[PDB]
Amino acid sequence: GTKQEKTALNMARHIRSQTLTLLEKLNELDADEQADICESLHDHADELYRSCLARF
Amino acid sequence: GTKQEKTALNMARHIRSQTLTLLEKLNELDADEQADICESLHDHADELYRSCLARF
């Protein structure tokens, strides 16, 4: 049960995180156009992460 | 000229990358629903990355 499938559940996990941390740092920065962009980004990166959770 | 602004150009850079690498690994995996999800994800993570490039 492939190690390629787990590594991808893993990257998708970590991208779900980075995008939240980035989102957070961009609020701090009142870089708010870009905050908004990263909110979307985070929300599709949990959509993917959870797509991966299921199928895997 | 804040180190908070550079760290965020940096995370956004790296997320642009991970999503491509993830996208690639998910083609390999013929996990194609999820490939499609990550293509979007990549494409908004370059949209953000380049939002950051400008303003910063």
Side-chain angles (χ1 to χ4, degrees), chain B residues 1-5 7-10 12-56:
Chain B
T2 82
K3 199 201 189 286
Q4 274 167 159
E5 285 174 2
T7 285
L9 202 50
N10 255 320
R13 176 176 292 145
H14 199 64
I15 288 173
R16 162 210 173 33
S17 263
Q18 279 182 82
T19 59
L20 184 42
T21 301
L22 192 41
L23 162 63
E24 273 164 17
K25 293 186 187 325
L26 293 168
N27 282 351
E28 186 135 66
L29 290 165
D30 281 300
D32 70 349
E33 172 177 328
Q34 303 87 189
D36 281 43
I37 284 168
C38 199
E39 191 198 348
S40 311
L41 191 68
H42 173 65
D43 292 5
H44 305 145
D46 183 51
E47 174 194 10
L48 173 63
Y49 171 49
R50 261 141 164 99
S51 208
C52 289
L53 249 193
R55 201 272 173 72
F56 311 135

Side-chain angles (χ1 to χ4, degrees), chain A residues 7-10 12-22:
Chain A
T7 285
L9 202 50
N10 255 320
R13 176 176 292 145
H14 199 64
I15 288 173
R16 162 210 173 33
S17 263
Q18 279 182 82
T19 59
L20 184 42
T21 301
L22 192 41

